[PDB]
Design a protein around this ligand. Sequence first.
Ligand SMILES: Cc1oc(-c2ccc(F)cc2)nc1CCOc1cc2ccccc2cn1
Ligand SMILES: [Mg+2]
Ligand SMILES: [Zn+2]
Length: 313
Amino acid sequence: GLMQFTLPVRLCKEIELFHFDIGPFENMWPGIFVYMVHRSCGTSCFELEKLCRFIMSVKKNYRRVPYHNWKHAVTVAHCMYAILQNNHTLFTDLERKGLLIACLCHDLDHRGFSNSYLQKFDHPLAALYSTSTMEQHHFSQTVSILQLEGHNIFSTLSSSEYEQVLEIIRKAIIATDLALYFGNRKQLEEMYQTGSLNLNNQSHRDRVIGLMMTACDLCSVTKLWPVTKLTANDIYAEFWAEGDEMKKLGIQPIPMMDRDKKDEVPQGQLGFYNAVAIPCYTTLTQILPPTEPLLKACRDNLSQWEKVIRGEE
Ligand SMILES: Cc1oc(-c2ccc(F)cc2)nc1CCOc1cc2ccccc2cn1
Ligand SMILES: [Mg+2]
Ligand SMILES: [Zn+2]
């Protein structure tokens, strides 16, 4: 109970910033996450014995794919930590608990293939869950792990508090399906503009948590240019493997996934920043003004991709 986690000075200071990179030492990522729970949530939120056992089982159920791996899980949880810490008073005790766990779990057992590829392959998961296929599987794996002996990090919550937090995690994980993002942000856009956005309305909170989940999930675009740039390689390495698998089913993949069309990546990152990322962090900044650094960092990386196109790198 008197057992804090602490971090070296450089990490203690940088972990508070949105552009923090968790670094290449896998063995420090559990301690980084627990540090974030303790400052975000409290030293009492979770039984340390149970939290540590939960983290390690989550880690074990992420696969060794180039991008949708254990490092992505912790990176997405750190972005959520940064948002929560800069918006201290807006979120309930249960949301602070739920959301860091949701982020850590949001891509559990990902294979590096999109929902589309599961549907065209005719993967068993695409019969079990017709939309948001991987995301319903991620939530499914989360409940699985919560139910292993010794892993119930929520066992101090009441019957109905337990149901509220698992319902926060479910919606948070479903929202990471980028197909649901577009409409969700349009609704938040109109609600914010017509002045009807109300955070006492549970359906409005749900929408806002959804957008945070998209913001944390895409946070690779909000780091310093060399982090953003090297992560884009991991992202495309999965896309090109999927493209290859599409060719093996006799389907020309979209250019984004075709490794013979690498030259179009810079122009594809512009489309992605303007169609997805910039709008996401704009609407997020409108609703939670302290998340502006994510918008500023995202715009800086858009400008770095423009420079790559103009052959100045
Ligand atoms: C998946 C995708 O969707 C689109 C896209 C989607 C809608 C649209 F109107 C135009 C482009 N381009 C991509 C290719 C690049 O996709 C991504 C996904 C990322 C996720 C996290 C951090 C960085 C990322 C960079 N590029
Ligand atoms: Mg996902
Ligand atoms: Zn993700």
